[PDB]
Amino acid sequence: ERDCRVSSFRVKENFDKARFSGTWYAMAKKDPEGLFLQDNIVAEFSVDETGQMSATAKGRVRLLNNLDVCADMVGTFTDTEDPAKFKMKYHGVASFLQKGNDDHWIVDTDYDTYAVQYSCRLLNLDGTCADSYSFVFSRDPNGLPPEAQKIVRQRQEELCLARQYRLIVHNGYC
Numbered sequence: 001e002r003d004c005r006v007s008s009f010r011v012k013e014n015f016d017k018a019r020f021s022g023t024w025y026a027m028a029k030k031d032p033e034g035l036f037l038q039d040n041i042v043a044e045f046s047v048d049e050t051g052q053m054s055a056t057a058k059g060r061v062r063l064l065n066n067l068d069v070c071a072d073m074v075g076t077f078t079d080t081e082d083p084a085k086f087k088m089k090y091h092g093v094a095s096f097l098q099k100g101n102d103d104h105w106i107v108d109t110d111y112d113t114y115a116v117q118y119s120c121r122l123l124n125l126d127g128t129c130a131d132s133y134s135f136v137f138s139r140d141p142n143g144l145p146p147e148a149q150k151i152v153r154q155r156q157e158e159l160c161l162a163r164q165y166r167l168i169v170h171n172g173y174c
Contacts, residue, residue, distance in 0.1 A: 004160035005127035006120045011084035012106045017047040019111040024137035026059070027144065028165045030156075032121055032133035036061050036098045038068055040174045043137065053077045053086070060174055061097070070174035071097055077104060088119075108155045113139055114148040116155045134161055141170045 026041035041059035048054070055075040063069045072093045077086040084106045091099035102119045109115035115137040120129035136152050138144045144152065156162040 002160065004129075006123060006129050007127055009105070009107065009118070009159060011082060011118075012108055013084070015084035015106050015109075016111065017045075017051065017053040020053070020106070020109065020115070021045045021047055022139070024115055024139065025141040025170060026135045026168045027138045028136040028167050030132065030134040030161045030164045031166070032119070033131045035133075037073075038062055039168050040070070040170055040172075041135070041168050042141075042170070043135075052079075058174060061092075063097075073097070075104075107134075107159060108151070109137075110148065110151075114144050114152055116152055116159075118159055118161075128160070132159075132161065134159060134165070136165070 022045060024043045024045065026043065029037070029041070037057070038060040041057060043055050043057040045053065045055045054077060057073045057075070058070065060068050061071045073090060074093065075088050075090040077088050079086060086104040087101060088104035089101045091097070102121055105118045107116040107118045117135040117137065118132065119134070120132045122129070122131040124130040136156070153162065156165065
């Protein structure tokens with residue numbers, strides 16, 4: 001019926017890095033295989049004079065099986081032909097924490113209220129994503145307003161992930 005091919009997913013038109021800078025609170029997440037960031041996830045986006053966007057994040061992470069710890073992560077984005085699609089090289093301040101390079105797409109955002117992020121780490125042979133993750137961010141840690149909430153639900157469905165998210169709590173644990 002619907003199209004779940006990654007190549008069919010729309011992303012933010014004319015994405016503006018500058019307007020996207022600042023603090024974003026993760027309110028919900030769709031986990032990929034071997035999930036890392038558990039909860040209390042807060043991201044800080046910045047952009048430098050060269051126009052390169054980067055980010056840092058803090059929150060509870062799954063160190064080992066049933067073993068969690070608060071950690072600081074770092075991300076650097078490399079542009080692609082699409083202003084909303086990036087390559088994100090990431091690592092923790094601790095060399096032993098998870099690191100790698102994932103696609104990082106800004107599916108949608110209004111810059112001052114909500115943001116929907118998406119990443120397909122591995123494609124299925126039919127174009128759909130085999131292993132994906134997605135973060136719904138809010139400028140306000142208390143949650144998104146109803147109008148933004150409804151738009152996000154629509155985006156989550158468009159990514160074929162609407163039934164697969166879990167809420168992210170912010171209780172100062174970290």
